[PDB]
Amino acid sequence: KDIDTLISNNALWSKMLVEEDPGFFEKLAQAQKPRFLWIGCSDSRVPAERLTGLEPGELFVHRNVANLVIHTDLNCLSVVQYAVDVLEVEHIIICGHSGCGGIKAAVENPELGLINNWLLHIRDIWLKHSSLLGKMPEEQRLDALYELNVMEQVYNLGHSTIMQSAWKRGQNVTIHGWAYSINDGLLRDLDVTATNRETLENGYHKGISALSLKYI
Amino acid sequence: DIDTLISNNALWSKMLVEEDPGFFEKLAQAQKPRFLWIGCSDSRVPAERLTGLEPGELFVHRNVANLVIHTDLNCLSVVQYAVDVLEVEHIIICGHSGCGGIKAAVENPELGLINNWLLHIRDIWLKHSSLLGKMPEEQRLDALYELNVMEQVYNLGHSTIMQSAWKRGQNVTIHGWAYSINDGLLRDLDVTATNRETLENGYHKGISALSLKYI
Amino acid sequence: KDIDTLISNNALWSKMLVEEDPGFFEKLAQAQKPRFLWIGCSDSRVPAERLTGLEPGELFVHRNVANLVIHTDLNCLSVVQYAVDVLEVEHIIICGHSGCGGIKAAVENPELGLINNWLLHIRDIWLKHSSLLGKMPEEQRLDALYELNVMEQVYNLGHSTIMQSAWKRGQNVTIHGWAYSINDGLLRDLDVTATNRETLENGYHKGISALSLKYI
Amino acid sequence: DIDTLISNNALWSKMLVEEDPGFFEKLAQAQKPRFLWIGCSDSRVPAERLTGLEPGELFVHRNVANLVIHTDLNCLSVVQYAVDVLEVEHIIICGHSGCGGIKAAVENPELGLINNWLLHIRDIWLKHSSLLGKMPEEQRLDALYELNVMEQVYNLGHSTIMQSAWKRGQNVTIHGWAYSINDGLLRDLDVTATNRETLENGYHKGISALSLKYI
Ligand SMILES: [Zn+2]
Ligand SMILES: [Zn+2]
Ligand SMILES: [Zn+2]
Ligand SMILES: [Zn+2]
């Protein structure tokens, strides 16, 4: 597949869409603001729209390597603040996936260059959960790590000034930590769902405990 | 609601597992993406539907108004991994009409934290003030989102990642595309670059072509 | 000079200070919050305390390569937000200096590595003022660039959400753009001094015009 | 006021120009710094007075609570320029008692933007919760600022810049120091590292020594 094919594919896709339903492009402008923010991995193994059946227009999306919410990453924080304060999304979903190159590189630590600094935030998670990871078979640790990573990023998201303020003011925002295996594309709820500070803390410990009981 | 998403996913997964189990086997079999797509978080039309590309062919970054800020380590980490590790052959920066970030940069409401990110668009707006003044006021927001794409391509080409890749003769082409939400038709802004010569010549070619389109 | 000498110097400096004036360390804790934020270069050719005669405790300091205030640099923005909203500094001084390695590297563009990305923000200034720079002798351009850089960083600082909010709420905060030549250590006011949005804009154009008239 | 600073500077400059004009000539003559100092924006005692180092010997970075965040490109750019370009021989991370950033991380007032930066200290606080629980509550803030320094040294050693410099055999020593504002005496936290072995062994040595000091 070359660039000339993409431009041609696009021309055909739009022409077939305009002739069958000319209203499709009209409606989208009229369609309400997105209700969901999706924070996922740049790998985008299965697009969020196909995973969830959500329409374009219902989702606002951020993608970065290994779907991180770093405390001081102004790129992700700016997407989150615009989504929560301006679009007033009702749900934020952080979704991780199995076979993630970023997760694998964080553990294997090849000398990849610049990206290694970003991946040190995953190495932090690997260290935080070293006791839990040591209780389970070595061949399961990478799978547990991508799920632990999601739960930690939800925990970071909930602790951000954006979410603390939104929740303290009683805004309706639910944050979710989901994951899927590439072997089935089935979304699994990691049970860290939070609607306020209480459910953020309770949900975080509930999700870690459930993962611990699943692998040990 | 959230139960509907889980319901849609369950039925979608079971349907694919039953009709073509090889689909997920083919997914598990690693075939590196050849394209990096840098687009807007608005994601008005997903990149896969716009281009007809299969998900395994794309590596994606999305941020507000599809910026490539010189010092944004989130985007730079995606670009460095894509170029040096995945060895993508193409990087496409795609902008779109009716972008909330572009509109907020011009209108300047007091939105909060996001206003700092949007000051990088205000920088571009000031840069092209003379060009924008030569066209009707009602056309300026449309010109601005296209000018924004071209400036982000220019930043991408100037990054250490792209300068190093081109100096070592790696095959990487960077593109600046845009689409109107009125038709979803991709338009090449003609800033396409494969090296330092085409980066500079392409940038001025794209600005001149936009100027001739609107003036 | 080795590390063992620094530890020994420190032991002697403190002992001579404690025996002569034991109250020195007591007073500092009691001393009021700093009234000034100094944003300067990591080169720190002449320390801010010696340049201004300010005491330790009167200054809150940030230093980075070429004294930048990037719109999206959360390190500098976090220092500024804490200084303005928490310490309630009355003055913010951005100070540049001649013979700055970062400024020179931005123009000469050696392949230095990671730092080149940070320096592209200086290359942006060089491009913005290309017409002005082209009107003056080539040997003067690097000197004009470090002063233009200061004025642009003041302009960025004033446009940040932190300063816009502080000023809109009537908080007393003055921002200054200063520079000194290493040949005399004399602070020069670049005349971009701003106490509100009006003086930010008027001051910026006043400083650029004055620099233009100085070099052309 | 501001006029006093300009007045102090004028008299200081004229005084040096008259008494020793060679001072500024020696300043203009480039002699690269051998030390990078990463300290807190509080700058309670300037690094030059604490150590007796001359300004030309130091390259300085200051941020709230002297952090080395894995993905902070401001600090990473200072470190990369210092290590690869200036080829500093020593990097000193210095923390201090009574740090406003450390106190705010624990007390968690709703300060605004800065709270996000401080979550990196809250990460460290949680990491050492068991150790902190073994000492009196009134000692915990003092232990925390020292633990913070050691963790930032650990981050610095793990950065691509330091891993690359040590792998190529460059002579760079990283230090974790702290001083109490009660005496200004520099204390070596004993996490000193020159390579990957001493980084790991030094980190555990420093934590164990702090544990034995407070428990
Ligand atoms: Zn991934
Ligand atoms: Zn957009
Ligand atoms: Zn400098
Ligand atoms: Zn401090």
* Domain-wise residue ranges, chain D: 1-215
Q: What is the 3-state secondary structure (H, E, C) of D47-107?
A: HHHHHCCCHHHEEEEEECCCCCCCCCHHHHHHHHHHHHHHCCCEEEEEEECCCHHHHHHHH
> How close is the nearest chain B Cα to the Cα of A198, in Å?
20
**Which residue from D80, D41, D84, D78 is spatially nearest to D62, judged by alpha carbons?**
D41
Q: CA-to-CA distance for C120 and C117, rounded, in angstroms? A: 5
How much distance in Å is there from the Cα of A75 to the middle of ligand 1? 18
Give the list of residues 6+ apart from residue A99 with CB closer than 8 angstroms, or none.
A45, A182, B28, B30
Contact A203, A192 (CB under 8 A): yes
Residue C114 and residue B72: Cβ atoms within 8 Å? no
Contact A106, A66 (CB under 8 A): yes
For chain A, list residues whose CB is within 8 angstroms of any CB belonging to chain D.
Answer: 70-73, 77, 111, 113-114, 116-118, 120-121, 123-124, 128, 156, 159-161, 164-165
Write b or e for each residue in B178-199: b if 16 or more Cβ atoms lie within 10 A of its Cβ, otherwise e. bbbbeebbbbebbbbbebeebb
Q: At D204, list the tokens.
A: 């555990």
DSSP labels for chain A? --HHHHHHHHHHHHHHHHHH-THHHHHHHHSPPPSEEEEEETT-SS-HHHHH-PPTTTEEEEEETT----TT-HHHHHHHHIIIIII--SEEEEEEETT-HHHHHHHH----STHHHHHHHHHHHHHHTHHHHHTS-GGGHHHHHHHHHHHHHHHHHHHSHHHHHHHHTT---EEEEEEE-TTT--EEE-S--BSSHHHHHHHHHHHHHHHHHHH-
Q: CA-to-CA distance for B199 and B191, rounded, in angstroms? A: 7
Structurally, what CATH architecture does the domain formed by B1-215 represent?
Answer: 3-Layer(aba) Sandwich (3.40)
Extended strands (E) in B3-51: 35-40
Q: CA-to-CA distance for D178 and A210, rounded, in angstroms? A: 41
Contact D39, D149 (CB under 8 A): no
Resolution (A): 1.5
In chain B, count H helices and then E strands.
10, 5
> What 3-state class would DSSP assign to C112?
coil
- Cβ count within 10 A of residue C85: 17
| Residue D77: C-alpha distances to residues A84, A134, B146, C198, D35 (Å) | 32, 36, 31, 34, 15
According to DSSP, residue B138 is labeled G
Q: At B111, list the tokens.
A: 């939105």
Measured between CB atoms, which of B34, B50, B74 is closest to A76?
B74
> What 3-state class would DSSP assign to B155?
helix
Provide the angle, in degrees to the nearest 10, between the axes of the packed helices C161-168 and C141-159: 60
According to DSSP, residue C96 is labeled E
Q: CA-to-CA distance for B41 and A87, rounded, in angstroms? A: 12
Q: Which of the ligands is closest to the CA of residue D41?
A: 4
Amino acid at A4: D
Residue D173 and residue C3: Cβ atoms within 8 Å? yes
Which residues from chain A sit within 8 angstroms of residue D119, using beta carbons? 71-72, 156, 159-160
Q: CA-to-CA distance for A202 and A194, rounded, in angstroms? A: 9
Q: CA-to-CA distance for C59 and C36, rounded, in angstroms? A: 5
> What 3-state class would DSSP assign to C136?
coil
Q: Which residue has the tokens 């330790």?
A: C56
Contact B177, B93 (CB under 8 A): yes
**Which residue from B36, B80, B83, B9 is spatially nearest to A42, judged by alpha carbons?**
B36
Q: CA-to-CA distance for B15 and B9, rounded, in angstroms? A: 10
**Which residue from B131, B135, B161, B163 is spatially nearest to B147, judged by alpha carbons?**
B131
According to DSSP, residue C183 is labeled T
Compute chain B's Rg from CA coordinates: 19
Q: CA-to-CA distance for D59 and D55, rounded, in angstroms? A: 8
In chain D, count H helices and then E strands.
10, 5
Q: At A10, list the tokens.
A: 């696009």
According to DSSP H, which parts of C38-193 are helical?
A: 48-52, 74-81, 101-108, 115-128, 130-134, 141-159, 161-168
How buried is C168 (Cβ within 10 angstroms: 0-12 exposed, 13-18 middle, 19+ buried)? exposed
**Which residue from B210, B95, B76, B105 is spatially nearest to B149, judged by alpha carbons?**
B95
Measured between CB atoms, which of B116, B160, B163 is closest to C72?
B116
> How close is the nearest chain D Cα to the Cα of C130, in Å?
26
Q: Which of the ligands is closest to the CA of residue D104?
A: 4
Q: CA-to-CA distance for A61 and C145, rounded, in angstroms? A: 39
How much distance in Å is there from the Cα of C65 to the middle of ligand 3? 6
Question: Pairing between strand D90-96 and D58-63?
Answer: unpaired
Which residues from chain A sit within 8 angstroms of residue C72, using beta carbons? 74-75, 78
Q: At C203, list the tokens.
A: 């001051």
- Cβ count within 10 A of residue A49: 18
- Concerning whether D44 is annotated as a catalytic residue, the answer is yes
Provide the angle, in degrees to the nearest 10, between the axes of the packed helices D114-127 and C74-81: 100
> What 3-state class would DSSP assign to D200?
helix
How much distance in Å is there from the Cα of A121 to the middle of ligand 2? 28
Measured between CB atoms, which of B42, B48, B64 is closest to A78?
B64
Q: How many Å from the N-terminal Cα to the C-terminal Cα in chain A?
A: 45
Q: CA-to-CA distance for D73 and D63, rounded, in angstroms? A: 12
Which residue in A has a C-alpha nearest to residue C113's C-alpha? A114
Q: CA-to-CA distance for B191 and B209, rounded, in angstroms? A: 10
Q: Which residue has the tokens 């894509």?
A: B82
Q: CA-to-CA distance for B135 and B133, rounded, in angstroms? A: 6
Which residues from chain D sit within 8 angstroms of residue A124, using beta carbons? 70, 123
Write b or e for each residue in D44-66: b if 16 or more Cβ atoms lie within 10 A of its Cβ, otherwise e. bbbbbbbbebebbbbbbbbbbbb
Any binding-site annotation on C97? Answer: yes
Question: Pairing between strand C36-41 and C91-97?
Answer: parallel
Give the list of residues 6+ apart from residue B181 with CB closer than 8 angstroms, or none.
A25, A28, A29, B44, B45, B96, B97, B98
Method: X-ray
Any binding-site annotation on D20? Answer: no
- Cβ count within 10 A of residue A131: 8
Residue D12 and residue C91: Cβ atoms within 8 Å? no
Any binding-site annotation on D190? Answer: no
Q: At A22, list the tokens.
A: 């000319």
The pair phi, psi for residue B34, each rounded to 5°, is: -100, -10
> How close is the nearest chain B Cα to the Cα of D28, in Å?
30
Residue B71 and residue C118: Cβ atoms within 8 Å? yes
Q: Which of the ligands is closest to the CA of residue B149?
A: 2
Residue A6 and residue B84: Cβ atoms within 8 Å? no
Which residues from chain D sit within 8 angstroms of residue A73, using beta carbons? 71
Q: At D78, list the tokens.
A: 């200072």
C-beta pairs of A168-171 under 8 Å, 24+ apart in sequence? A168/A197, A171/A84, A171/A88
Give the list of residues 6+ apart from residue D150 with CB closer than 8 angstroms, or none.
D176, D189, D191, D203, D206, D207, D210
Q: CA-to-CA distance for A69 and A152, rounded, in angstroms? A: 9
Q: CA-to-CA distance for C50 and A181, rounded, in angstroms? A: 61
Q: CA-to-CA distance for B1 and B7, rounded, in angstroms? A: 10
The pair phi, psi for residue C136, each rounded to 5°, is: -115, 160
Length of chain A: 216
How much distance in Å is there from the Cα of A199 to the middle of ligand 1? 27
Residue B173 and residue A3: Cβ atoms within 8 Å? yes
Give the list of residues 6+ apart from residue C191 with CB closer than 8 angstroms, or none.
C177, C203, C206, C207, C210
Which residues from chain B sit within 8 angstroms of residue A105, using beta carbons? 85
Any binding-site annotation on B75? Answer: no
Which chains lie within 8 Å of chain B at 3 or more CB pairs, if any? Answer: A, C, D
> How close is the nearest chain A Cα to the Cα of D126, in Å?
10
Q: CA-to-CA distance for A127 and B88, rounded, in angstroms? A: 32
| Residue C145: C-alpha distances to residues B186, C125, C130, C180, D122 (Å) | 40, 8, 10, 13, 40
> How close is the nearest chain A Cα to the Cα of D14, in Å?
44
Compute chain D's Rg from CA coordinates: 19
How much distance in Å is there from the Cα of D42 to the middle of ligand 4? 5
Q: CA-to-CA distance for D43 and A183, rounded, in angstroms? A: 54
Which residue in A has a C-alpha nearest to residue D72's C-alpha? A72
Contact A79, A60 (CB under 8 A): yes
> CATH class for domain C1-216?
alpha beta
Which residue in A has a C-alpha nearest to residue B47's C-alpha? A47
Residue C77 and residue D113: Cβ atoms within 8 Å? yes
**Which residue from B143, B180, B149, B99 is spatially nearest to A14, judged by alpha carbons?**
B180
**Residue B139 Cα to chain centre, angstroms:** 21
Residue C200 parent element (H or E) = helix C197-215
> What 3-state class would DSSP assign to B134?
coil
Order of all β-strands in the sheet with A187-189: A187-189, A174-180, A91-97, A36-41, A59-64, B58-63, B35-40, B90-96, B173-179, B186-188
Which residue in B has a C-alpha nearest to residue A97's C-alpha? B28
